[PDB]
């Protein structure tokens with residue numbers, strides 16, 4: 001182990017888009033936390049080398065980690081991770097973010113041969129709806145919703161984690177020309193060279209749909225090892241359900257509406273919350 005102020009850093013417990021997460025014992029309150037460890041110089045290099053003056057690269061890449069911190073400081077919800085401390089010396093390269101620990105870790109790593117039952121998928125999906133509606137109300141889009149970023153706590157409820165690429169918008173929605181994400185979870189409107197911008201909140205809904213499909217089938221609905229073919233399938237392949245496991249028709253309807261390739265007609269979170277599959281047991 002190693003010592004960092006009042007914390008004793010132990011094994012790696014996660015690795016997200018940036019940095020690594022360590023188990024950290026706080027000697028002041030005899031409690032374990034999760035500590036994300038980052039290198040400022042490594043974050044700057046991850047955005048790419050800057051271009052000589054003549055999809056524009058941001059001028060100051062280090063601003064995204066400080067946006068992530070500002071976003072996390074704003075959020076207090078039982079289905080969202082809780083940032084408790086930031087350790088950041090301006091004369092040091094490392095940055096540390098301390099979170100309340102969510103003991104069981106990620107709910108699923110896609111693909112899996114052990115999907116969730118329909119009733120357990122509903123319980124976790126109800127948690128995901130609560131967390132996402134709260135983020136959207138706080139004018140936050142997550143941009144990387146997938147099962148591996150949903151942590152299961154001691155209480156069996158999930159918390160949304162990995163805000164590394166999250167964005168705060170002004171107004172009613174985020175207006176995007178391009179976006180980040182895990183390709184198998186990216187919405188079709190984000191994968192074409194077009195003149196048209198798209199809604200950030202509808203990207204999160206599409207990713208919730210791919211997540212729910214993963215919860216019950218253990219793999220994404222559109223999949224290919226060849227990136228160009230994956231993008232083509234997301235944009236042009238009709239959604240299909242495997243013959244087994246057999247799932248309820250109302251669940252198929254909900255997933256179909258979340259995975260509407262047209263973001264204008266795609267179901268919105270206030271409607272998802274009242275869908276018959278979500279409100280029954």
Ligand SMILES: COc1ccc2c(-c3ccc(C(=O)O)c(C4CCCC4)c3)ccnc2c1
Pocket residue numbers: 013014015016017018021034036081099100101102103104105106148149150151161162163164
């Ligand atoms: C038991 O295992 C864990 C692992 C990560 C945790 C975290 C945590 C903190 C920050 C990030 C991030 O990269 O931004 C992450 C990601 C790493 C991969 C999954 C999401 C997790 C928080 C609280 N309890 C955790 C418990």
